[PDB]
Design a binder for this molecule. Sequence first.
Ligand SMILES: Nc1ncnc2c1ncn2[C@@H]1O[C@H](COP(=O)(O)OP(=O)(O)OP(=O)(O)O)[C@@H](O)[C@H]1O
Ligand SMILES: Nc1ncnc2c1ncn2[C@@H]1O[C@H](COP(=O)(O)OP(=O)(O)OP(=O)(O)O)[C@@H](O)[C@H]1O
Ligand SMILES: [Cl-]
Ligand SMILES: [Cl-]
Ligand SMILES: [Cl-]
Ligand SMILES: [Cl-]
Ligand SMILES: [Cl-]
Ligand SMILES: [Cl-]
Lengths: 684, 684
Amino acid sequence: GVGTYDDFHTIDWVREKCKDRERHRRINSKKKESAWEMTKSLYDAWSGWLVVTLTGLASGALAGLIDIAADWMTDLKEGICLSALWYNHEQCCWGSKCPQWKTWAELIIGQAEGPGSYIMNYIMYIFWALSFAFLAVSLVKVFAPYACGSGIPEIKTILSGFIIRGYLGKWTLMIKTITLVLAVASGLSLGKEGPLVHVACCCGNIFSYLFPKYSTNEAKKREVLSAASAAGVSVAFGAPIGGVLFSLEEVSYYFPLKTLWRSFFAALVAAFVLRSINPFGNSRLVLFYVEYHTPWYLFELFPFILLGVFGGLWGAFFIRANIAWCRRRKSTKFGKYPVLEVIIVAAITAVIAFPNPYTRLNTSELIKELFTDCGPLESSSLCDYRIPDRPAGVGVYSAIWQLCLALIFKIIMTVFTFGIKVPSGLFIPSMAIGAIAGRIVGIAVEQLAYYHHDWFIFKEWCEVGADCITPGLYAMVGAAACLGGVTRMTVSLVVIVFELTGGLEYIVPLMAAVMTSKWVGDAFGREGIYEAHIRLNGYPFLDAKEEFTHTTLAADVMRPRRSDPPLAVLTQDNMTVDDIENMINETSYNGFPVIMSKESQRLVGFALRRDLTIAIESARKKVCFAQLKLRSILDMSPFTVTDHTPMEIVVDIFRKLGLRQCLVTHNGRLLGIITKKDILRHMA
Amino acid sequence: GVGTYDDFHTIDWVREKCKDRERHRRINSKKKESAWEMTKSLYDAWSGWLVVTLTGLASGALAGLIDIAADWMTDLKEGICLSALWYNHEQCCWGSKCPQWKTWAELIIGQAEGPGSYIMNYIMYIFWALSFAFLAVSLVKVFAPYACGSGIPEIKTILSGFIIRGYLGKWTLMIKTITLVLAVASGLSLGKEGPLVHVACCCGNIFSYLFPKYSTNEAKKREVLSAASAAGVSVAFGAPIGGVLFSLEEVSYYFPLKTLWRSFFAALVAAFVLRSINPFGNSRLVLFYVEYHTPWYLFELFPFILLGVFGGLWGAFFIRANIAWCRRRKSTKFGKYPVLEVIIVAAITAVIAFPNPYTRLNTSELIKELFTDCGPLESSSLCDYRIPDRPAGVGVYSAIWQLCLALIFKIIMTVFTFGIKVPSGLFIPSMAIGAIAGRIVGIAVEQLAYYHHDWFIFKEWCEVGADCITPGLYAMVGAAACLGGVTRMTVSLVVIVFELTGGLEYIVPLMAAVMTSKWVGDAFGREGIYEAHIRLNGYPFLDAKEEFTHTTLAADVMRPRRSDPPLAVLTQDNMTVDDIENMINETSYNGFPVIMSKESQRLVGFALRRDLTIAIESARKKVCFAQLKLRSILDMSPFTVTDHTPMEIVVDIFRKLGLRQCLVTHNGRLLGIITKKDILRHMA
Ligand SMILES: Nc1ncnc2c1ncn2[C@@H]1O[C@H](COP(=O)(O)OP(=O)(O)OP(=O)(O)O)[C@@H](O)[C@H]1O
Ligand SMILES: Nc1ncnc2c1ncn2[C@@H]1O[C@H](COP(=O)(O)OP(=O)(O)OP(=O)(O)O)[C@@H](O)[C@H]1O
Ligand SMILES: [Cl-]
Ligand SMILES: [Cl-]
Ligand SMILES: [Cl-]
Ligand SMILES: [Cl-]
Ligand SMILES: [Cl-]
Ligand SMILES: [Cl-]
């Protein structure tokens, strides 16, 4: 009861460490009694690894199930396997003019070809997109409203000590899994690689309730959630090291430096399980893994910067636009019709995505297709090729024509499709936009090389009789650049991309593009999409990157100020239960400093509203703060900071010790308070 | 002048960050003036990468020169190349019964063979070992006494805020490089992979003096030294990621999490330069790099854990013996004759090392030879081999006979040879002991398989007609186990070994052996050799691993106590210059809390002894602490901690904020002080 946090309230890390140390000391003291006690001590020491093991296994299994179901449903959106329903397009057209895999054309009209067949299949595609999106949104809105969104901003904030009760519950887990399957299969411009961080964390917290070492403490729960975020990123991208780096850079806030072992173990186990789910012998590390064995020239490092600029522009644009829409979704009647909005967005996406073969094609499959360089047996519109370069024809001319339309559609539709009441991610759509840009640039460069090989730009570098330009590498570079320009990741992202598509040959291009994208995006604000959404949602996230440039001390920020009412303080014996109840029920404060006397104004300690209420209720059912004596709940070591302290030290105290509130005094006299939110309000 | 630290005094991290913020604000304000100011701001922003670049290049070049010179001198200890003096044994016997490479035998006696030849070559080997060791020790003792020892404990401590003035100076760098070349070439049981962490750091600090951003600040110097330690470990083992992990785990103390980029850049550049030094086309990544393409069975994971036990025993034994000797070297007349002690040790090592071919052979070369599994063209005593296994003879029996003697000699002689006045390291000798144990175990297992293949232990796992046991993998496992049992490294060490010897096939055996070694060593004390030597030297190192188990508050530790004289405090106007001078000259304290009046005992601020002295001298050449007015030097935000505070929070303040000293009060009254050393003294 005592020391229980309220909803949407930040965590006093220091008290968590204190009670954890008390538990450790008690366990060690009980250890020496007999063999069972050392056994229990070993069990409690290994609980930190048991939670990570279970979290990794659950994350791997959930990612495998989600991927299988999303593939099957996305393919059900187009046709069905008459021979055996439990197959997708790939399996029903490979495992043997395929007579088994039938689109709705011959099912309904009876003719596989014709304008009527195309119209009816268009209608059926739109209908299935609408049905999937509507079901996902209804299920989220009715069973677990916390399933919406990528949930990386909220997990981030939750690892900064913040609290959101059901956000990582069982029902959020189940509904997020189901609705993520149903949304990635709805044709929306969204992915489930971003959301896989949340659905992974949902596992960890759940498993944290199996062990008293973590259920009864919050800081250790944050350790388990950091490990779970690493496991989630790993199982999403299949990159354990990349996932751990992402956890260090973006998500995790307190890192004792011992959890790196646990984070990497979680990531490794998650990736191992994800690999273990190979029910049909899929050799692809992920649904968008591509390998490269082609060279690049220093000249190509110029366009690889160009994409970096583009990915730096669009990124900023997106963060400049998406929030500008999300605000309008929250500050307008659009926020009262979530289901209608998602149905409208799914209908528009399915209407404008069917005509274009690339937009109609699943975003992760589109990323795979863009990554792979043209093959000899491929005659698709992408590589309709008619000297060191292949000849060109009309087909490659139309390839750019329609790929530009795909790029524009994805850019426009991901702005309106990120924040909506359905599990949506920003990794896959950003990578798709970046990869489309990269493929466009790569085709342009290859065509330039073929038509104008005689120039010294290609005469020396490009070997005669050998194709030198690699469009797939440009697509990968563009994906990395756009992803880093929307999320402002530098090394975590580059390592994620490197593991995502093996090969160290393209570390220089990847670093160049990612760094250029970040340096271009920072010119229009130094906040990534996750930081911008943490800000927009108004979460109490203390960003260490932000600098308290203002030269102001704790004198300015301590509250109450002159205008605000007198500082609320307690006493030792003068007052009674009635007084404390009256001043609690009339005050929204969660904590009261206690002094001896009104005139003395000398600090004694600190007490919390929740602890006071619980203890007072217990006493009433079943006042003397000094030695109704309620000293037990009292805090005799409340952090103080002299008013002359420049606020940088106070912010550093909050960020390092993880306090909720530090008092403020002037030469041994209590004057004000600074909660974890007071500094945030001051920054605004 | 003001705010200058004294010798062997710890660093107030908080003040360093504060003055760094002041400098940042001033530079940013000056930025807007004109183009040159933005140029200067960019220059100061890239200084952090320029220092790391220079440190990495210098570390690579110094490691290359050290390795070349050590090879040449170690080979000069045996013979010379008549055709061209600037060649070692490998080059003078490969680049064409070699007539060029002549040992001293035919040079002096004239006959290459005979008992007299052997005796005189033995005498010359001992003489050259003595000469090299004596020259190294004389040069260290006369030019830079800080060059002695591995210097990893001292660098560690220096990254914890401690200060040692010349320890990373130019002269320590030069003398350490020369004497490390001369000591690794003296036949002593020591290495230069450990010392290269110091030789790298010596570079960084030196380069830190090229830039006001780091010369005038100490915390940023510690960041550069962390990057330099990463670069040093990388250039030593050729493992950038392993070096960065070692810096994170062992050396670095404060990691803002942004220096990881700088640490990895330093490590990468150092390894790149080290590779770039290939004047004779050496394809070996390092002098002891070995590749493996052989399998292992689960059965061998039992002996691979046995070595872990052995490496866990010996490790502890070493940390139970070496310190027990180092104390005796410091608490006895042995400490008054460093040169004589090192000459005696070199003479004994050269006397007992010549007879044994493995002991006579350079420790790094011996590690390389142990790592490589037997080859078809190798007929050495190590693989004197006469069914899935090769037949055996007397030669393999003698191999174990003398390899056990090599193991015993190295174990006994590294205990007496680590701490002595000459640059010595513990990586190579520990790896050599581990690898000798590993080869012993591997040969034993292979012989068991050959003689008793019929047993089901090998009848199933070991394929008929194919050799299954890999002695070289046992050597690697033993090296890793002993290294981790003497240094108590878990993941940094495993990654260092993995990069040092490409191949993920042996990650499971390496983890098993390293973890077993650490868990066995912890049973005999939970401190690595570096921690044990930091303790023995009495450095003020606050080890986060240590737990302040004692349930005592800041009341217990605050000084002065009842017995100690009255707490030293100051006033505002009552006293005069004479009083302050008298109390400074009669007190060894470096800090003085200031209150208003003796009776009020209300805390105002804090003033350091060095600042007081400098300002007082300036005023005398060229008292009113409130608004001789010396408020400017005063600290108006001195950290306080109520006496009821359990010491864990105070230790956490010191470890996170990096304070030197926090005061201690009781209900708004100054009662005591705690320094960074008071908590350490209490722990003892
Ligand atoms: N005892 C007090 N007397 C006066 N002002 C206080 C006292 N305790 C807190 N405050 C101030 O009142 C405001 C509300 O703080 P409060 O304690 O309610 O924060 P919180 O519970 O952490 O936040 P939230 O509003 O999210 O619940 C802040 O300005 C805080 O500084
Ligand atoms: N103003 C003071 N009045 C009384 N005791 C003090 C005062 N300042 C420090 N002390 C105590 O004196 C002892 C040494 O403090 P001091 O300031 O000299 O340490 P230091 O300079 O950091 O250490 P070192 O001895 O390595 O130079 C410690 O017990 C410290 O708590
Ligand atoms: Cl959202
Ligand atoms: Cl997807
Ligand atoms: Cl996301
Ligand atoms: Cl030493
Ligand atoms: Cl060596
Ligand atoms: Cl060492």
